[PDB]
């Protein structure tokens, strides 16, 4: 640590610190946020005349009123203002930008007679879509937290942190609880259940090194409130439960349309409501499927606390602050409040630190072919997770080679199998067929595959038809010059030598599709066939004739149009789709187009415009790999594979956009191949893969605990329980679920309860003999000071109220009516304590119990949020007074 070498050079010392401060250069709102919609009249319409022309900006200012979303509000506070009403404030430029396009420009196009009626109706439909979306923001979706804030001299109204339907957690706002219960009481109810819940990660049975023997069953379990669970769906749950009991990890590999999401939701329901494994579970899905997952948990398991973890940095911070742990502010280690977490692949990589440091109990990865590569970032990030059991959901466990399946297995079973060999159909020795038999036998207990034909037989069959069409003259010229690297002929008509021969396979496929994919080919043709063909219909000849595939395609289109068929044309290159979209434009056919540049908003517009009953569209141009697995074009009938793929599953998925559950015609497929080109090397290499997948898959502390010993804390817990619920013999498993009583057998609790009431009855007997001598506490198992008289009288009080409400207003505890005779009022409290307040108090002690006054105060279902002032003007009522008032009102009811 002492330097043994210095410089004798006499240079001046330097300060190398480059940290600076900008302090020497020194000396949450309420403005327009969004403009939803406008109105024809700012106040009153003095005349509908002069509808011609388009209004000016000043005219719009003096003629309309707008619905304004305000910053720091919550859409429920949207008001109708005018340019004059609000006047001057932030965000005024947003209002001007609204007037510029939705009023001025929009009316301009509607005045031009060059616009067809079909375009006018499209704009009308679009405006309808915009406002229909803006309606969903009023509906609350989930209540996150509740605080008793104190308004400006407004006592302490209750505020609900509400998240809205189509918004994230950076848009969640506080709202007055009295209005929330009027808007959506079902979500208030769900927040109540989620508040004091039995299903909690801290109270799960730790099945370690020994798991209960699962029994294959044939009854849809009662905790599955969704609907009618299919037979092939019930089979999967038993499969997964068996694999879990043994301690194994499987793969759900059904085909699309069999509901693989329902089966895994119902399995989590089983894993919680049966084996009491309700810890933190994680489900990783693609973004496009996240809606369909969420509502499934909302329908087939409405009691589970499932949260969605996605959004911007602020929105993801809100979730961690309010919905992760039971108590976040505590400095010590925090617990977990949720049961199921739903995230996407993007945030597994962003927040791997905040998510990997959690003891998960079950991981489920949807679309697990995304994990077919063991060197990807998602793979190395999901393996570092500390999870017990795992499951993968994929309709294609193997796609190209056998290394993909090996990586999936090593994700599930890190070390069990050892798939370190690749099948080759060239050697075909007896040992290789043995290898196929070996793997096909070893993985069978871990893959559950079913087909759309083996079940759900109502499905029209699909037939594939390969068509080999030879090249043309321009195609043969280009294929020849590229195959020989003859730069000169390829660059004779080029703009800067743009002809690049890096990746020759790519150029041979561009030539085998259409010569116009190369630059200046349009100049060579047309000019060298019909020089002077600058007019249309003659250019169309250049398109259709310069390609061998264009000929067969044009013939097919003319033939198919007259028959009652619709066409889906798939291609690998989107530039070939531009060429096709020009041939169809000059011809005059109506088509749709979906590729990787079309934003998600326009995609669903296109899909519905194609599936409308009065649809003038004939064909749909589709990129082969775009869109994902959610596109549904079952109205079309014919599928034309223009370009093939190295992966056969990528083309099968393109066929499944018309051959799915719901298809009612015979789907016809047309492959277009160019003979004696590299295209034939693709199909052949694809076929091998199609055979491999049919050969491997498609063949079928510091102190110890105890058991049931009752201690001092156990007696104090049972004493406070006899100070609240009292008769808990029929409610023993409930209090043991939420953690009130320690982990003890219900038998010992019942025994101690009989002993408690007997020691109290003997106490009151001794007190009776000790009160008439000259004319109340008793210790139990160490706990001193236990009121016997008050406890037994309270037991009789609660039992009286139970047999007065469990049979009278059972199916409606809120709808309750006291007797016509009214007891005398209170001793002048700070609130208008009438008879309805007494009835609501009677229901509150029934639902939340005695002593728990903070629970009774915080419940808008009663209506006494601001009528009770236990703690934060010193008010008259209190915790002792409400209890004495119940013992006075109930004694008035008994007689």
């Amino acid at each position: 640590k002492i330097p043994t070498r210095f410089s004798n050079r006499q240079n001046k010392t330097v300060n190398y610190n480059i940290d600076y401060s900008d302090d020497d250069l020194l000396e949450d709102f309420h403005g327009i946020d969004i403009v939803i919609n406008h109105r024809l009249k700012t106040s009153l319409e003095e005349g509908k005349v002069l509808e011609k022309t388009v209004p000016d900006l000043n005219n719009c200012k003096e003629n309309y009123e707008f619905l304004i979303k305000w910053t720091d509000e919550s859409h429920l506070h949207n008001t109708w203002e005018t340019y004059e009403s609000i006047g001057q404030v932030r965000g005024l430029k947003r209002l001007d930008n609204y007037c510029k396009q939705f009023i001025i420009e929009d009316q301009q196009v509607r005045l031009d007679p060059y616009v067809t009626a079909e375009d006018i109706e499209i704009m009308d439909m679009e405006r309808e879509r915009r406002l229909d979306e803006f309606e969903e923001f009023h509906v609350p979706e989930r209540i996150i937290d509740s605080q008793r804030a104190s308004l400006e001299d407004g006592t302490s109204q209750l505020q609900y942190l509400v998240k809205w339907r189509r918004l994230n957690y950076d848009e969640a706002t506080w709202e007055n609880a009295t209005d929330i219960v009027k808007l959506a009481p079902e979500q208030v109810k769900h927040f109540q259940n989620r508040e004091n819940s039995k299903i909690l990660p801290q109270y799960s049975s730790n099945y370690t090194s020994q798991r209960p023997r699962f029994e294959k069953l044939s009854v849809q379990p009662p905790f599955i409130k969704g609907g009618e669970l299919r037979d092939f769906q019930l089979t999967g749950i038993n499969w997964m439960a068996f694999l879990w009991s043994k301690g194994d990890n499987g793969i759900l590999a059904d085909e699309m349309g069999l509901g693989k999401t329902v089966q895994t939701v119902a399995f989590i329901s089983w894993l919680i409501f049966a084996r009491r494994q309700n810890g933190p579970h994680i489900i990783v899905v693609p973004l496009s499927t996240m809606p369909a997952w969420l509502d499934t948990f909302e329908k087939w398991a409405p009691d589970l606390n499932c949260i969605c973890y996605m959004g911007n940095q602020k929105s993801r911070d809100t979730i961690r602050e309010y919905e992760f742990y039971t108590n976040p502010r505590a400095k010590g280690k925090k617990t977990m409040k949720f049961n199921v977490l739903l995230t996407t692949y993007e945030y597994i990589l962003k927040d791997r630190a905040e998510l990997g440091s959690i003891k998960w109990q079950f991981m489920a990865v949807d679309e697990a072919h995304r994990l077919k590569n063991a060197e990807s970032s998602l793979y190395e990030s999901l393996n570092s997770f500390k999870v017990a059991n795992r499951m993968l959901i994929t309709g294609t466990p193997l796609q190209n080679n056998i290394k993909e399946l090996a990586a999936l297995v090593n994700f599930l079973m890190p070390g069990r199998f050892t798939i370190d060999q690749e099948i080759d159909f060239e050697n075909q020795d007896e040992e290789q067929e043995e290898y196929i038999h070996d793997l096909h036998r070893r993985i069978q207990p871990f893959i559950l595959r079913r087909l759309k034909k083996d079940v759900e037989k109502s499905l029209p069959s699909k037939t594939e038809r390969i068509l080999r069409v030879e090249l043309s003259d321009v195609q043969t010229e280009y294929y020849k010059n590229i195959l020989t690297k003859n730069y000169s002929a390829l660059t004779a008509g080029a703009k800067g030598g743009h002809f690049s021969l890096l990746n020759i396979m790519n150029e041979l496929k561009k030539a085998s599709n259409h010569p116009y994919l190369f630059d200046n080919a349009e100049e060579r043709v047309l000019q060298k066939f019909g020089d002077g063909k600058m007019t249309r219909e003659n250019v169309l000849r250049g398109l259709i004739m310069s390609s061998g595939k264009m000929v067969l395609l044009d013939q097919l289109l003319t033939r198919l149009k007259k028959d009652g068929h619709r066409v889906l044309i798939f291609s690998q290159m989107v530039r070939m789709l531009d060429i096709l979209g020009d041939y169809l434009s000059i011809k005059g056919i109506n088509f749709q187009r979906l590729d990787g540049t079309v934003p998600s908003a326009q995609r669903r517009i296109s899909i519905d415009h194609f599936n409308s009953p009065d649809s003038n569209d004939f064909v749909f141009l589709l990129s082969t790999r775009a869109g994902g697995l959610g596109i549904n074009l079952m109205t079309a009938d014919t599928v034309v594979i223009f370009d093939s793929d190295w992966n056969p599953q990528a083309d099968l998925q393109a066929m499944a956009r018309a051959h799915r559950i719901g298809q009612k015609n015979h789907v016809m497929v047309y492959r277009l191949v160019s003979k004696d080109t590299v295209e034939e090397e693709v199909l052949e290499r694809a076929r091998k893969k199609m055979i491999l997948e049919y050969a491997i898959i498609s063949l079928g502390r510091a102190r110890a605990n105890d058991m049931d010993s009752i201690g001092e804390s156990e007696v104090r817990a049972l004493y406070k329980a006899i100070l609240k619920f009292g008769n808990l013999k029929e409610i023993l498993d409930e209090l043991i679920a939420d953690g009130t009583l320690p982990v003890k057998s219900f038998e010992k609790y019942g025994e101690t309860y009989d002993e408690m009431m007997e020691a109290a009855k003997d106490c009151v007997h001794e007190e009776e003999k000790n009160r008439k001598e000259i004319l109340v506490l008793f210790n139990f198992k160490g706990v001193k000071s236990l009121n016997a008289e008050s406890l037994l009288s309270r037991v009789e009080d609660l039992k009286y109220l139970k047999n007065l409400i469990n049979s009278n207003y059972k199916d409606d505890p809120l709808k309750f009516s006291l007797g016509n005779n009214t007891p005398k009022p209170v001793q002048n409290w700070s609130s208008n304590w009438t008879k309805e307040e007494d009835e609501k108090l009677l229901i509150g002690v029934f639902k939340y119990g005695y002593g728990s006054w903070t629970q009774i105060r915080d419940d808008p279902f009663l209506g006494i949020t601001d009528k009770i002032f236990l703690n934060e003007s010193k008010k008259v009522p209190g915790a002792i007074h409400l209890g004495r008032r119940v013992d006075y009102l109930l004694s008035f009811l008994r007689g």
Partner: protein, 89 residues
């Protein structure tokens, strides 16, 4: 309309955006910048690159290669009095 024509794309020299040129002027300590500077700067950079690449490609063709490596660039920079440290290994 016209979809097969792969044109209407910005030039590659224009990918050196005006904010990027302004950041480079800020690291040089410049306070105000004229509006005509941005087309001037693009012309200067384009000349500079053309002199370095022409040399690197020469070094690449002599070695009978098709790949321009980092050493080709280091040598091309060195032979015009602009030695660069940090890539020569």
């Amino acid at each position: 309309g016209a979809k097969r024509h792969r044109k209407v794309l910005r030039d590659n020299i224009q990918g050196i955006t005006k904010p990027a040129i302004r950041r480079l002027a800020r690291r040089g300590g410049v306070k105000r910048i004229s509006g005509l500077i941005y087309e001037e700067t693009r012309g200067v950079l384009k000349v500079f690159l053309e002199n370095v690449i022409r040399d690197a490609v020469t070094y690449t063709e002599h070695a009978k290669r098709k790949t321009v490596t980092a050493m080709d660039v280091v040598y091309a920079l060195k032979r015009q009095g602009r030695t660069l440290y940090g890539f020569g290994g």
